[PDB]
Design an enzyme around this catalytic site. Sequence first.
Site, PDB file in Angstrom:
ATOM      1  N   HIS B  40      -6.083  37.165   9.484  1.00 50.35           N
ATOM      2  CA  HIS B  40      -7.841  37.036   9.713  1.00 50.35           C
ATOM      3  C   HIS B  40      -8.213  38.707   9.383  1.00 50.35           C
ATOM      4  O   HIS B  40      -9.427  38.493   8.538  1.00 50.35           O
ATOM      5  CB  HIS B  40      -8.411  35.425   9.483  1.00 50.35           C
ATOM      6  CG  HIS B  40      -8.169  34.500   9.449  1.00 50.35           C
ATOM      7  ND1 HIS B  40      -7.202  33.727   9.517  1.00 50.35           N
ATOM      8  CD2 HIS B  40      -8.929  33.751   8.020  1.00 50.35           C
ATOM      9  CE1 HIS B  40      -7.899  32.852   8.834  1.00 50.35           C
ATOM     10  NE2 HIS B  40      -8.280  32.718   7.611  1.00 50.35           N
ATOM     11  N   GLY B 145     -16.259  38.164  18.540  1.00 49.10           N
ATOM     12  CA  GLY B 145     -15.224  38.933  19.055  1.00 49.10           C
ATOM     13  C   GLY B 145     -14.298  38.999  20.355  1.00 49.10           C
ATOM     14  O   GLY B 145     -13.640  39.806  20.628  1.00 49.10           O
ATOM     15  N   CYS B 147     -11.282  37.382  19.141  1.00 48.92           N
ATOM     16  CA  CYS B 147     -10.714  37.814  18.663  1.00 48.92           C
ATOM     17  C   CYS B 147      -9.175  38.666  18.125  1.00 48.92           C
ATOM     18  O   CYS B 147      -9.673  40.337  18.896  1.00 48.92           O
ATOM     19  CB  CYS B 147     -10.741  37.688  16.767  1.00 48.92           C
ATOM     20  SG  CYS B 147     -10.416  35.588  16.739  1.00 48.92           S
TER      21      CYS B 147
END
Lengths: 188, 188
Positions: B40, B145, B147
């Site tokens: 992502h 925040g 990831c």
Amino acid sequence: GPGFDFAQAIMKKNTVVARTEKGEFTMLGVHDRVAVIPTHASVGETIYINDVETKVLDACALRDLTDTNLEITIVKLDRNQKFRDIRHFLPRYEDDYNDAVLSVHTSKFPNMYIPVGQVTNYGFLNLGGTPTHRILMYNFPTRAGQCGGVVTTTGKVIGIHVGGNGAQGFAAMLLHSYFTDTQKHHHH
Amino acid sequence: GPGFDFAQAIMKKNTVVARTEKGEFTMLGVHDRVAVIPTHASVGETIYINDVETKVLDACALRDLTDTNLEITIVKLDRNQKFRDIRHFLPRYEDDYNDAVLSVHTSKFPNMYIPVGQVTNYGFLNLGGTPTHRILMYNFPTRAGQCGGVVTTTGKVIGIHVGGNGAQGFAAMLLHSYFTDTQKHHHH
Ligand SMILES: *[C@@H](CC(=O)OCC)[C@H](C[C@@H]1CCNC1=O)NC(=O)OC(C)(C)C
Ligand SMILES: *[C@@H](CC(=O)OCC)[C@H](C[C@@H]1CCNC1=O)NC(=O)OC(C)(C)C
């Protein structure tokens, strides 16, 4: 090598989430039903402790003999559980320290640990426009949401987090004599 | 007793802050100039590594033999420094784990550690509408925040953080065979 194990033992037995009209703060319980919180939390007559509404029986916003803010508010709480007594882990005197950990316990961060490195006896700080004494400083970019966070080394609980400028973080000291079972006078 | 020391050694030598058009992510460097980041992040032809613009020489968005997203993107970076080779700390196989640590290294949190407790081989996850396999799950309220955050136990680097539902957090596994010096085919 930061004292992560010590920090974690303190967080597990001795912190709760406190919420005032100003928001949430990590709250360190010290002994019996006595805890601390930064003075900017603006403790009133009631407070939430782990989302349970709780009567505040006493709140003492500490100031030194120059009548200057120390940013520690000691609170006495109407609740059933006693805190494990950790007064023996509080330093006797002002000091500098190595390799400290800052730990946070809020809804957003129920258990988080940040090595902040060296901690120096810093002294005066203009804290959000309030003159403040007895401040500890660490070169770490602490953020909103971390106020009340507990600053430890192995075997000592040295302060709670109260401020930062984007590059450095600031804690108000805790000293052993703040909590000694003492004597009689009108404090309000 | 979480392996805080191990987590900290990994963070210190093997993480950088990576920033793509999607924001900042903790980035684990694995060997040579090869690192990982959640898929992502949408890695393009360049990326910022510790705020230095850096050519992305290869980006492989891993999928399994069912042609399903694994959420790991392996990147090869044009930079001078080699990462310490930590392939020997990657697990060989899928597994469950005890007492894991999640560690984050971003601008907002340059060094933070969160004990997430037990980690279970969870399998399928609808990740933000993308079907995903090989997911690990921990019962901890992870946030935006985090990831790319690295999930470790002592002696193993087991995954990177990719998602959460407000009560649980999710990491994509890392396996040793993702990084073995291998053979020849057209991958783009
Ligand atoms: C902790 C309390 C807080 O977030 O209140 C919201 C206004 C703050 C920590 C510092 C903020 C920036 N970095 C920090 O480490 N302290 C704080 O905001 O202090 C006052 C005096 C309330 C401005
Ligand atoms: C990490 C990436 C991120 O914050 O992107 C901003 C949209 C996110 C972690 C979870 C968010 C809520 N709690 C978490 O632990 N992951 C994320 O947002 O996943 C997608 C699939 C991008 C929605």
